[PDB]
PDB file of C-alpha atoms and ligand atoms in Angstrom:
ATOM      1  CA  UNK R  16      -0.105   0.380  -0.035  1.00  0.00           C
ATOM      2  CA  UNK R  17       3.052   2.497   0.853  1.00  0.00           C
ATOM      3  CA  UNK R  18       5.303   1.001  -2.130  1.00  0.00           C
ATOM      4  CA  UNK R  19       3.367   1.706  -5.671  1.00  0.00           C
ATOM      5  CA  UNK R  20       3.644   0.543  -9.259  1.00  0.00           C
ATOM      6  CA  UNK R  21       5.472   1.793 -12.630  1.00  0.00           C
ATOM      7  CA  UNK R  22       6.987   0.937 -15.409  1.00  0.00           C
ATOM      8  CA  UNK R  23      10.507   0.557 -16.205  1.00  0.00           C
ATOM      9  CA  UNK R  24      13.687  -0.444 -18.745  1.00  0.00           C
ATOM     10  CA  UNK R  25      17.321  -0.334 -18.220  1.00  0.00           C
ATOM     11  CA  UNK R  26      19.388   0.790 -20.799  1.00  0.00           C
ATOM     12  CA  UNK R  27      23.363   0.968 -19.995  1.00  0.00           C
ATOM     13  CA  UNK R  28      22.966  -0.326 -16.877  1.00  0.00           C
ATOM     14  CA  UNK R  29      20.156   2.688 -15.850  1.00  0.00           C
ATOM     15  CA  UNK R  30      16.701   2.498 -15.089  1.00  0.00           C
ATOM     16  CA  UNK R  31      14.030   4.631 -16.220  1.00  0.00           C
ATOM     17  CA  UNK R  32      10.562   5.727 -15.579  1.00  0.00           C
ATOM     18  CA  UNK R  33       7.719   5.796 -17.852  1.00  0.00           C
ATOM     19  CA  UNK R  34       5.498   8.705 -17.496  1.00  0.00           C
ATOM     20  CA  UNK R  35       3.826   9.571 -20.294  1.00  0.00           C
ATOM     21  CA  UNK R  36       3.758   8.584 -24.595  1.00  0.00           C
ATOM     22  CA  UNK R  37       4.907  11.582 -26.492  1.00  0.00           C
ATOM     23  CA  UNK R  38       3.678  10.637 -30.019  1.00  0.00           C
ATOM     24  CA  UNK R  39       4.321   8.968 -33.066  1.00  0.00           C
ATOM     25  CA  UNK R  42       6.221   2.852 -37.318  1.00  0.00           C
ATOM     26  CA  UNK R  43       7.201   4.237 -33.992  1.00  0.00           C
ATOM     27  CA  UNK R  44       6.771   5.466 -30.217  1.00  0.00           C
ATOM     28  CA  UNK R  45       8.142   7.912 -28.270  1.00  0.00           C
ATOM     29  CA  UNK R  46       7.817   7.745 -24.257  1.00  0.00           C
ATOM     30  CA  UNK R  47       8.686  10.266 -21.704  1.00  0.00           C
ATOM     31  CA  UNK R  48      10.762   8.699 -19.404  1.00  0.00           C
ATOM     32  CA  UNK R  49      12.712   9.704 -15.843  1.00  0.00           C
ATOM     33  CA  UNK R  50      16.225   8.593 -15.005  1.00  0.00           C
ATOM     34  CA  UNK R  51      15.900   7.660 -12.024  1.00  0.00           C
ATOM     35  CA  UNK R  52      19.890   8.319 -10.860  1.00  0.00           C
ATOM     36  CA  UNK R  53      19.831  11.406 -12.206  1.00  0.00           C
ATOM     37  CA  UNK R  54      16.315  13.037 -12.011  1.00  0.00           C
ATOM     38  CA  UNK R  55      16.540  14.075 -15.773  1.00  0.00           C
ATOM     39  CA  UNK R  56      13.522  13.570 -18.310  1.00  0.00           C
ATOM     40  CA  UNK R  57      14.256  11.487 -21.763  1.00  0.00           C
ATOM     41  CA  UNK R  58      12.467  10.899 -25.135  1.00  0.00           C
ATOM     42  CA  UNK R  59      12.557   7.018 -25.554  1.00  0.00           C
ATOM     43  CA  UNK R  60      11.981   6.851 -29.209  1.00  0.00           C
ATOM     44  CA  UNK R  61      11.370   3.135 -30.169  1.00  0.00           C
ATOM     45  CA  UNK R  62      11.356   1.270 -33.637  1.00  0.00           C
ATOM     46  CA  UNK R  63       9.506  -1.636 -34.773  1.00  0.00           C
ATOM     47  CA  UNK R  64      11.760  -4.203 -36.528  1.00  0.00           C
ATOM     48  CA  UNK R  65      10.199  -6.780 -38.878  1.00  0.00           C
ATOM     49  CA  UNK R  66      13.340  -6.925 -40.830  1.00  0.00           C
ATOM     50  CA  UNK R  67      17.002  -6.303 -40.843  1.00  0.00           C
ATOM     51  CA  UNK R  68      16.463  -3.526 -42.909  1.00  0.00           C
ATOM     52  CA  UNK R  69      15.007  -2.050 -40.008  1.00  0.00           C
ATOM     53  CA  UNK R  70      17.517  -3.010 -37.362  1.00  0.00           C
ATOM     54  CA  UNK R  71      20.118  -1.229 -40.538  1.00  0.00           C
ATOM     55  CA  UNK R  72      18.209   1.886 -40.888  1.00  0.00           C
ATOM     56  CA  UNK R  73      18.208   2.429 -36.716  1.00  0.00           C
ATOM     57  CA  UNK R  74      21.623   1.773 -36.422  1.00  0.00           C
ATOM     58  CA  UNK R  75      22.042   4.341 -39.228  1.00  0.00           C
ATOM     59  CA  UNK R  76      19.966   7.268 -37.576  1.00  0.00           C
ATOM     60  CA  UNK R  77      21.680   6.753 -33.947  1.00  0.00           C
ATOM     61  CA  UNK R  78      24.947   6.759 -35.882  1.00  0.00           C
ATOM     62  CA  UNK R  79      24.270  10.879 -37.544  1.00  0.00           C
ATOM     63  CA  UNK R  80      23.396  11.449 -33.918  1.00  0.00           C
ATOM     64  CA  UNK R  81      27.071  10.773 -33.237  1.00  0.00           C
ATOM     65  CA  UNK R  82      28.655  12.571 -35.863  1.00  0.00           C
ATOM     66  CA  UNK R  83      27.659  15.539 -34.174  1.00  0.00           C
ATOM     67  CA  UNK R  84      28.233  17.201 -30.522  1.00  0.00           C
ATOM     68  CA  UNK R  85      26.897  21.324 -31.507  1.00  0.00           C
ATOM     69  CA  UNK R  86      24.478  22.582 -29.243  1.00  0.00           C
ATOM     70  CA  UNK R  87      21.979  23.216 -32.426  1.00  0.00           C
ATOM     71  CA  UNK R  88      21.743  19.316 -33.251  1.00  0.00           C
ATOM     72  CA  UNK R  89      19.822  17.197 -30.901  1.00  0.00           C
ATOM     73  CA  UNK R  90      22.098  14.014 -29.278  1.00  0.00           C
ATOM     74  CA  UNK R  91      22.040  10.947 -28.612  1.00  0.00           C
ATOM     75  CA  UNK R  92      22.293   9.625 -25.058  1.00  0.00           C
ATOM     76  CA  UNK R  93      21.853   5.906 -25.497  1.00  0.00           C
ATOM     77  CA  UNK R  94      21.173   3.778 -28.133  1.00  0.00           C
ATOM     78  CA  UNK R  95      20.158  -0.355 -27.776  1.00  0.00           C
ATOM     79  CA  UNK R  96      18.099  -3.511 -29.086  1.00  0.00           C
ATOM     80  CA  UNK R  97      15.544  -4.892 -27.117  1.00  0.00           C
ATOM     81  CA  UNK R  98      13.540  -8.084 -27.913  1.00  0.00           C
ATOM     82  CA  UNK R  99      10.870 -10.391 -26.162  1.00  0.00           C
ATOM     83  CA  UNK R 100       9.694 -13.109 -27.876  1.00  0.00           C
ATOM     84  CA  UNK R 101       8.956 -12.309 -30.975  1.00  0.00           C
ATOM     85  CA  UNK R 102       8.925  -8.483 -30.455  1.00  0.00           C
ATOM     86  CA  UNK R 103      11.834  -6.645 -31.388  1.00  0.00           C
ATOM     87  CA  UNK R 104      12.748  -2.884 -31.237  1.00  0.00           C
ATOM     88  CA  UNK R 105      15.491  -0.535 -31.186  1.00  0.00           C
ATOM     89  CA  UNK R 106      15.769   1.948 -29.117  1.00  0.00           C
ATOM     90  CA  UNK R 107      16.986   5.746 -28.762  1.00  0.00           C
ATOM     91  CA  UNK R 108      17.248   7.690 -25.655  1.00  0.00           C
ATOM     92  CA  UNK R 109      17.126  11.369 -25.847  1.00  0.00           C
ATOM     93  CA  UNK R 110      17.381  14.611 -24.350  1.00  0.00           C
ATOM     94  CA  UNK R 111      13.582  15.926 -23.617  1.00  0.00           C
ATOM     95  CA  UNK R 112      12.604  19.431 -24.537  1.00  0.00           C
ATOM     96  CA  UNK R 113       9.310  20.311 -22.502  1.00  0.00           C
ATOM     97  CA  UNK R 114       8.638  23.215 -25.173  1.00  0.00           C
ATOM     98  CA  UNK R 115       8.337  20.928 -28.048  1.00  0.00           C
ATOM     99  CA  UNK R 116       8.546  21.903 -30.995  1.00  0.00           C
ATOM    100  CA  UNK R 117       8.808  25.250 -33.484  1.00  0.00           C
ATOM    101  CA  UNK R 118       5.636  24.644 -34.936  1.00  0.00           C
ATOM    102  CA  UNK R 119       3.512  24.632 -31.949  1.00  0.00           C
ATOM    103  CA  UNK R 120       5.112  27.685 -30.577  1.00  0.00           C
ATOM    104  CA  UNK R 121       4.269  29.247 -33.957  1.00  0.00           C
ATOM    105  CA  UNK R 122       1.193  28.461 -33.728  1.00  0.00           C
ATOM    106  CA  UNK R 123       0.683  29.190 -29.991  1.00  0.00           C
ATOM    107  CA  UNK R 124       1.408  33.060 -31.612  1.00  0.00           C
ATOM    108  CA  UNK R 125      -0.887  32.584 -34.225  1.00  0.00           C
ATOM    109  CA  UNK R 126      -3.880  31.332 -32.507  1.00  0.00           C
ATOM    110  CA  UNK R 127      -3.700  34.406 -30.436  1.00  0.00           C
ATOM    111  CA  UNK R 128      -3.340  36.873 -33.642  1.00  0.00           C
ATOM    112  CA  UNK R 129       0.158  37.186 -33.202  1.00  0.00           C
ATOM    113  CA  UNK R 130       4.413  36.259 -34.395  1.00  0.00           C
ATOM    114  CA  UNK R 131       7.759  36.075 -33.763  1.00  0.00           C
ATOM    115  CA  UNK R 132       9.163  39.313 -33.060  1.00  0.00           C
ATOM    116  CA  UNK R 133      12.251  39.890 -35.389  1.00  0.00           C
ATOM    117  CA  UNK R 134      14.793  39.570 -33.037  1.00  0.00           C
ATOM    118  CA  UNK R 135      13.383  36.578 -32.046  1.00  0.00           C
ATOM    119  CA  UNK R 136      13.078  35.625 -35.674  1.00  0.00           C
ATOM    120  CA  UNK R 137      16.850  36.472 -35.957  1.00  0.00           C
ATOM    121  CA  UNK R 138      17.827  34.670 -33.126  1.00  0.00           C
ATOM    122  CA  UNK R 139      16.169  31.247 -34.251  1.00  0.00           C
ATOM    123  CA  UNK R 140      17.229  31.586 -37.479  1.00  0.00           C
ATOM    124  CA  UNK R 141      21.022  31.915 -36.394  1.00  0.00           C
ATOM    125  CA  UNK R 142      20.919  29.037 -34.442  1.00  0.00           C
ATOM    126  CA  UNK R 143      19.045  27.014 -37.414  1.00  0.00           C
ATOM    127  CA  UNK R 144      22.006  27.697 -39.706  1.00  0.00           C
ATOM    128  CA  UNK R 145      24.742  27.084 -37.304  1.00  0.00           C
ATOM    129  CA  UNK R 146      23.581  23.489 -37.067  1.00  0.00           C
ATOM    130  CA  UNK R 147      23.131  23.359 -40.658  1.00  0.00           C
ATOM    131  CA  UNK R 148      26.641  24.737 -41.013  1.00  0.00           C
ATOM    132  CA  UNK R 149      27.900  21.778 -38.855  1.00  0.00           C
ATOM    133  CA  UNK R 150      26.427  19.240 -41.169  1.00  0.00           C
ATOM    134  CA  UNK R 151      27.186  20.665 -44.189  1.00  0.00           C
ATOM    135  CA  UNK R 152      30.930  20.881 -43.242  1.00  0.00           C
ATOM    136  CA  UNK R 153      30.925  17.550 -42.462  1.00  0.00           C
ATOM    137  CA  UNK R 154      29.080  16.275 -46.430  1.00  0.00           C
ATOM    138  CA  UNK R 155      26.034  15.788 -45.367  1.00  0.00           C
ATOM    139  CA  UNK R 156      22.306  17.072 -46.006  1.00  0.00           C
ATOM    140  CA  UNK R 157      19.745  17.120 -43.551  1.00  0.00           C
ATOM    141  CA  UNK R 158      16.865  16.239 -46.221  1.00  0.00           C
ATOM    142  CA  UNK R 159      13.903  16.894 -44.045  1.00  0.00           C
ATOM    143  CA  UNK R 160      14.199  20.244 -42.307  1.00  0.00           C
ATOM    144  CA  UNK R 161      10.821  21.976 -41.441  1.00  0.00           C
ATOM    145  CA  UNK R 162       9.686  23.296 -38.140  1.00  0.00           C
ATOM    146  CA  UNK R 163       8.143  19.969 -36.731  1.00  0.00           C
ATOM    147  CA  UNK R 164      11.736  19.218 -36.613  1.00  0.00           C
ATOM    148  CA  UNK R 165      13.039  21.980 -34.709  1.00  0.00           C
ATOM    149  CA  UNK R 166      12.819  21.845 -30.797  1.00  0.00           C
ATOM    150  CA  UNK R 167      13.094  24.401 -28.616  1.00  0.00           C
ATOM    151  CA  UNK R 168      15.625  24.068 -26.021  1.00  0.00           C
ATOM    152  CA  UNK R 169      15.222  25.356 -21.939  1.00  0.00           C
ATOM    153  CA  UNK R 170      17.294  28.742 -22.899  1.00  0.00           C
ATOM    154  CA  UNK R 171      15.116  29.509 -26.117  1.00  0.00           C
ATOM    155  CA  UNK R 172      17.986  27.689 -28.196  1.00  0.00           C
ATOM    156  CA  UNK R 173      16.766  25.672 -31.440  1.00  0.00           C
ATOM    157  CA  UNK R 174      17.878  22.104 -31.891  1.00  0.00           C
ATOM    158  CA  UNK R 175      17.746  19.963 -34.682  1.00  0.00           C
ATOM    159  CA  UNK R 176      16.069  16.407 -35.159  1.00  0.00           C
ATOM    160  CA  UNK R 177      14.986  13.588 -36.959  1.00  0.00           C
ATOM    161  CA  UNK R 178      18.149  12.467 -39.171  1.00  0.00           C
ATOM    162  CA  UNK R 179      16.759   9.537 -40.519  1.00  0.00           C
ATOM    163  CA  UNK R 180      17.102  11.370 -44.060  1.00  0.00           C
ATOM    164  CA  UNK R 181      20.188  12.637 -43.713  1.00  0.00           C
ATOM    165  CA  UNK R 182      22.643  11.574 -46.877  1.00  0.00           C
ATOM    166  CA  UNK R 183      26.014  12.158 -48.526  1.00  0.00           C
ATOM    167  CA  UNK R 184      25.197  16.447 -49.959  1.00  0.00           C
ATOM    168  CA  UNK R 185      26.764  15.852 -52.916  1.00  0.00           C
ATOM    169  CA  UNK R 186      24.617  13.498 -55.293  1.00  0.00           C
ATOM    170  CA  UNK R 187      25.707  13.189 -59.292  1.00  0.00           C
ATOM    171  CA  UNK R 188      22.843  12.285 -61.747  1.00  0.00           C
ATOM    172  CA  UNK R 189      23.687  11.095 -64.941  1.00  0.00           C
ATOM    173  CA  UNK R 190      20.668   9.570 -67.026  1.00  0.00           C
ATOM    174  CA  UNK R 191      16.951   8.687 -65.916  1.00  0.00           C
ATOM    175  CA  UNK R 192      17.606   5.458 -64.141  1.00  0.00           C
ATOM    176  CA  UNK R 193      19.465   7.772 -61.619  1.00  0.00           C
ATOM    177  CA  UNK R 194      17.599  10.768 -61.492  1.00  0.00           C
ATOM    178  CA  UNK R 195      13.986   8.665 -60.933  1.00  0.00           C
ATOM    179  CA  UNK R 196      15.584   6.578 -58.272  1.00  0.00           C
ATOM    180  CA  UNK R 197      16.320   9.636 -56.534  1.00  0.00           C
ATOM    181  CA  UNK R 198      13.141  11.472 -57.433  1.00  0.00           C
ATOM    182  CA  UNK R 199      11.160   8.374 -55.759  1.00  0.00           C
ATOM    183  CA  UNK R 200      13.748   8.346 -52.858  1.00  0.00           C
ATOM    184  CA  UNK R 201      12.638  12.018 -52.219  1.00  0.00           C
ATOM    185  CA  UNK R 202       8.671  11.469 -52.096  1.00  0.00           C
ATOM    186  CA  UNK R 203       9.377   8.753 -49.759  1.00  0.00           C
ATOM    187  CA  UNK R 204      11.930  10.912 -47.001  1.00  0.00           C
ATOM    188  CA  UNK R 205      11.084  14.886 -48.088  1.00  0.00           C
ATOM    189  CA  UNK R 206       8.360  16.349 -46.948  1.00  0.00           C
ATOM    190  CA  UNK R 207       6.224  17.608 -49.747  1.00  0.00           C
ATOM    191  CA  UNK R 208       5.566  21.013 -48.954  1.00  0.00           C
ATOM    192  CA  UNK R 209       9.340  21.750 -47.710  1.00  0.00           C
ATOM    193  CA  UNK R 210      10.793  19.605 -50.503  1.00  0.00           C
ATOM    194  CA  UNK R 211      13.299  21.834 -53.046  1.00  0.00           C
ATOM    195  CA  UNK R 212      12.392  22.477 -56.602  1.00  0.00           C
ATOM    196  CA  UNK R 213      15.263  20.651 -57.827  1.00  0.00           C
ATOM    197  CA  UNK R 214      14.066  17.333 -56.647  1.00  0.00           C
ATOM    198  CA  UNK R 215      10.460  17.284 -57.942  1.00  0.00           C
ATOM    199  CA  UNK R 216      11.251  16.421 -61.797  1.00  0.00           C
ATOM    200  CA  UNK R 217      14.775  15.419 -61.188  1.00  0.00           C
ATOM    201  CA  UNK R 218      16.992  15.985 -64.368  1.00  0.00           C
ATOM    202  CA  UNK R 219      18.550  13.203 -66.179  1.00  0.00           C
ATOM    203  CA  UNK R 220      21.987  15.115 -65.929  1.00  0.00           C
ATOM    204  CA  UNK R 221      22.951  17.149 -63.042  1.00  0.00           C
ATOM    205  CA  UNK R 222      24.569  17.691 -59.403  1.00  0.00           C
ATOM    206  CA  UNK R 223      22.021  17.591 -56.557  1.00  0.00           C
ATOM    207  CA  UNK R 224      23.495  18.913 -53.744  1.00  0.00           C
ATOM    208  CA  UNK R 225      23.398  20.659 -49.616  1.00  0.00           C
ATOM    209  CA  UNK R 226      21.581  23.576 -51.228  1.00  0.00           C
ATOM    210  CA  UNK R 227      18.182  21.417 -50.956  1.00  0.00           C
ATOM    211  CA  UNK R 228      18.237  22.000 -47.347  1.00  0.00           C
ATOM    212  CA  UNK R 229      18.766  26.183 -47.876  1.00  0.00           C
ATOM    213  CA  UNK R 230      15.534  25.960 -49.482  1.00  0.00           C
ATOM    214  CA  UNK R 231      13.875  24.242 -47.163  1.00  0.00           C
ATOM    215  CA  UNK R 232      15.341  27.015 -44.379  1.00  0.00           C
ATOM    216  CA  UNK R 233      13.702  29.398 -46.193  1.00  0.00           C
ATOM    217  CA  UNK R 234      10.596  28.167 -45.417  1.00  0.00           C
ATOM    218  CA  UNK R 235      10.910  27.675 -42.050  1.00  0.00           C
ATOM    219  CA  UNK R 236      11.996  31.243 -42.224  1.00  0.00           C
ATOM    220  CA  UNK R 237       8.843  32.000 -44.187  1.00  0.00           C
ATOM    221  CA  UNK R 238       6.572  30.070 -41.577  1.00  0.00           C
ATOM    222  CA  UNK R 239       8.131  31.841 -38.938  1.00  0.00           C
ATOM    223  CA  UNK R 240       7.378  35.140 -41.011  1.00  0.00           C
ATOM    224  CA  UNK R 241       3.781  34.753 -41.576  1.00  0.00           C
ATOM    225  CA  UNK R 242       2.132  31.850 -39.195  1.00  0.00           C
ATOM    226  CA  UNK R 243       2.645  29.430 -42.059  1.00  0.00           C
ATOM    227  CA  UNK R 244       4.655  27.470 -44.382  1.00  0.00           C
ATOM    228  CA  UNK R 245       4.335  29.003 -47.975  1.00  0.00           C
ATOM    229  CA  UNK R 246       2.687  25.660 -49.438  1.00  0.00           C
ATOM    230  CA  UNK R 247       0.096  25.038 -46.655  1.00  0.00           C
ATOM    231  CA  UNK R 248      -2.810  26.573 -48.277  1.00  0.00           C
ATOM    232  CA  UNK R 249      -1.999  24.698 -51.638  1.00  0.00           C
ATOM    233  CA  UNK R 250      -1.094  21.187 -49.961  1.00  0.00           C
ATOM    234  CA  UNK R 251      -4.378  21.459 -47.447  1.00  0.00           C
ATOM    235  CA  UNK R 252      -6.709  22.670 -50.480  1.00  0.00           C
ATOM    236  CA  UNK R 253      -5.844  19.316 -52.265  1.00  0.00           C
ATOM    237  CA  UNK R 254      -3.959  21.162 -55.818  1.00  0.00           C
ATOM    238  CA  UNK R 255      -0.147  20.722 -56.722  1.00  0.00           C
ATOM    239  CA  UNK R 256       2.381  21.343 -54.247  1.00  0.00           C
ATOM    240  CA  UNK R 257       5.089  20.179 -57.278  1.00  0.00           C
ATOM    241  CA  UNK R 258       3.831  23.491 -59.958  1.00  0.00           C
ATOM    242  CA  UNK R 259       3.470  25.694 -57.098  1.00  0.00           C
ATOM    243  CA  UNK R 260       6.823  25.526 -55.630  1.00  0.00           C
ATOM    244  CA  UNK R 261       8.150  25.566 -59.412  1.00  0.00           C
ATOM    245  CA  UNK R 262       6.944  28.650 -59.636  1.00  0.00           C
ATOM    246  CA  UNK R 263       7.439  31.880 -57.524  1.00  0.00           C
ATOM    247  CA  UNK R 266       7.133  37.338 -50.514  1.00  0.00           C
ATOM    248  CA  UNK R 267       4.561  40.386 -48.946  1.00  0.00           C
ATOM    249  CA  UNK R 268       6.824  43.240 -47.060  1.00  0.00           C
ATOM    250  CA  UNK R 269       4.829  42.984 -44.189  1.00  0.00           C
ATOM    251  CA  UNK R 270       6.342  46.217 -42.405  1.00  0.00           C
ATOM    252  CA  UNK R 271       6.931  44.301 -39.107  1.00  0.00           C
ATOM    253  CA  UNK R 272      10.238  42.925 -41.324  1.00  0.00           C
ATOM    254  CA  UNK R 273      12.829  44.850 -42.220  1.00  0.00           C
ATOM    255  CA  UNK R 274      13.992  44.644 -45.849  1.00  0.00           C
ATOM    256  CA  UNK R 275      17.127  43.302 -44.702  1.00  0.00           C
ATOM    257  CA  UNK R 276      15.026  40.089 -43.280  1.00  0.00           C
ATOM    258  CA  UNK R 277      13.034  40.176 -46.446  1.00  0.00           C
ATOM    259  CA  UNK R 278      16.117  39.844 -48.490  1.00  0.00           C
ATOM    260  CA  UNK R 279      17.355  36.852 -46.765  1.00  0.00           C
ATOM    261  CA  UNK R 280      14.311  35.228 -47.440  1.00  0.00           C
ATOM    262  CA  UNK R 281      14.413  35.780 -51.717  1.00  0.00           C
ATOM    263  CA  UNK R 282      17.575  34.970 -51.855  1.00  0.00           C
ATOM    264  CA  UNK R 283      17.271  31.264 -49.308  1.00  0.00           C
ATOM    265  CA  UNK R 284      13.429  30.655 -51.849  1.00  0.00           C
ATOM    266  CA  UNK R 285      15.202  30.955 -55.123  1.00  0.00           C
ATOM    267  CA  UNK R 286      14.280  28.564 -57.598  1.00  0.00           C
ATOM    268  CA  UNK R 287      17.417  27.588 -59.669  1.00  0.00           C
ATOM    269  CA  UNK R 288      19.811  26.322 -56.704  1.00  0.00           C
ATOM    270  CA  UNK R 289      23.013  27.713 -58.925  1.00  0.00           C
ATOM    271  CA  UNK R 290      21.624  31.107 -57.461  1.00  0.00           C
ATOM    272  CA  UNK R 291      20.730  30.033 -53.937  1.00  0.00           C
ATOM    273  CA  UNK R 292      23.643  30.807 -51.573  1.00  0.00           C
ATOM    274  CA  UNK R 293      25.325  28.498 -49.173  1.00  0.00           C
ATOM    275  CA  UNK R 294      25.335  28.430 -45.559  1.00  0.00           C
ATOM    276  CA  UNK R 295      28.422  30.103 -44.588  1.00  0.00           C
ATOM    277  CA  UNK R 296      27.673  32.922 -46.731  1.00  0.00           C
ATOM    278  CA  UNK R 297      24.198  33.292 -45.490  1.00  0.00           C
ATOM    279  CA  UNK R 298      25.374  33.377 -41.996  1.00  0.00           C
ATOM    280  CA  UNK R 299      27.876  36.005 -43.003  1.00  0.00           C
ATOM    281  CA  UNK R 300      24.914  38.283 -43.999  1.00  0.00           C
ATOM    282  CA  UNK R 301      22.599  36.887 -40.255  1.00  0.00           C
ATOM    283  CA  UNK R 302      26.053  37.470 -37.976  1.00  0.00           C
ATOM    284  CA  UNK R 303      26.419  41.268 -39.564  1.00  0.00           C
ATOM    285  CA  UNK R 304      22.659  42.274 -38.109  1.00  0.00           C
ATOM    286  CA  UNK R 305      23.909  41.171 -34.769  1.00  0.00           C
ATOM    287  CA  UNK R 306      21.219  39.211 -33.786  1.00  0.00           C
ATOM    288  CA  UNK R 307      20.283  39.582 -29.977  1.00  0.00           C
ATOM    289  CA  UNK R 308      20.411  36.264 -27.718  1.00  0.00           C
ATOM    290  CA  UNK R 309      16.833  36.431 -25.453  1.00  0.00           C
ATOM    291  CA  UNK R 310      16.733  38.305 -21.814  1.00  0.00           C
TER     292      UNK R 310
HETATM  293 CL1   CL U 401      20.653 -11.390 -32.763  1.00  0.00          CL
END
């Protein structure tokens, strides 16, 4: 009567207490570490084939490529089975503020938006995260506001590295173009997907500037309360066509910020900037930390 029931797991010899389901192929659970008091998000991936163990290894490995404040770290990885049930587990830090998306809905539901100083700090954090990814030779490939957590100091943190791959891809011939086009149709949220990945051309080079387009959409989302192709998506018409055609000057935004958004959302990737240039442009605006 003085004891109480609980459900727990052991990971790397440490006991974690189930608290609640956080969300979702995979579940995510809120758990509490009983050694240290801290909270974690335990992502559990269901395996039916060897490929599934392999895909989860891959993701775990992407996380441990980096030790950067704007990139979600991996606390532990493991494999668990019981009878026929087989799972792979990624233990991760818990961000009580949730995602950048639900912060920009919270405001848009009261009629407000993020201020320009808030926008500039967030954007700086996201670019520095990407810069670290690009410098190692990868691209994220599924950047969007629901893949961006907000830390306890308000810092933005990138998550979901299960579509990350080599940054540079040479497409030669229709067969390679089409296999790439199908891969993106699978792994790159359609309304945040770069133009060059619809109708992949037979001879071309797809590089990490793919992420700079997606980042432009995230910026747009922060500035207008929705993604630039969400009404199109939600009203059933063709995103692929909208994305291949081509922002308002709402006087809550400096033209400097408006120029940043325009440059990111250029359709020809050859005319689109790389992250190091964007950071140079951003840091000259001398963005303030929150406080
Ligand atoms: Cl085994």
